[PDB]
Amino acid sequence: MYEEFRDVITFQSYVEQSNGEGGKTYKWVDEFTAAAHVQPISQEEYYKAQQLQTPIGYNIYTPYDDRIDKKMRVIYRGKIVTFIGDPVDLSGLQEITRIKGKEDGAYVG
């Protein structure tokens, strides 16, 4: 609902252990700090037709940073969200990275 943005926001991680046991106990760590824009999808982004569901998708652009959605828990403009994703670069000179991330779950949490 911000459209075009650049604020100083903090990217962090919530990971349910740094070994092959996803659950049991949970540990918090900090990733990086950047001038960035993390925004939620709202609906289908382009809209056109309609459709309804509860939003579990994020859209982000940061200049050359690929670390936002790729298993993280970030705080952008006071909002804490959890998501997994894949980064793509804009190309040419290599100035902008465009990332998509989404949330699902893991059994109980």
UniProtKB/Swiss-Prot annotation:
Signal peptide: none annotated. Coiled coil: none annotated. Pfam families: Phage_H_T_join. One of its GO terms (biological process) is symbiont genome ejection through host cell envelope, long flexible tail mechanism. GO terms for cellular component: virion component. It is found in: Virion. It comes from the Viruses. Keywords: Viral genome ejection through host cell envelope, Viral long flexible tail ejection system, Viral penetration into host cytoplasm, Virion, Virus entry into host cell. Its main location: virion. InterPro entries: Phage_SPP1_head-tail_adaptor, SSP1_head-tail_sf. The keyword Glycoprotein does not apply. Belongs to the Caudoviricetes gp7/gp16 head completion protein family. Homododecamer. Interacts with the connector protein gp15. Interacts with the head-tail joining protein gp17. Functions as a stopper that is part of the head-tail connector and that locks the viral DNA in the capsid. Following tail attachment to the entry receptor, seems to open by a diaphragm-like motion, allowing the genome to exit the capsid through the tail tube to the host cell. During assembly, functions as a docking platform which the preassembled tail tapered by the head-tail joining protein gp17 can bind to. This is Head completion protein gp16. It comes from Bacillus phage SPP1. The gene is 16.
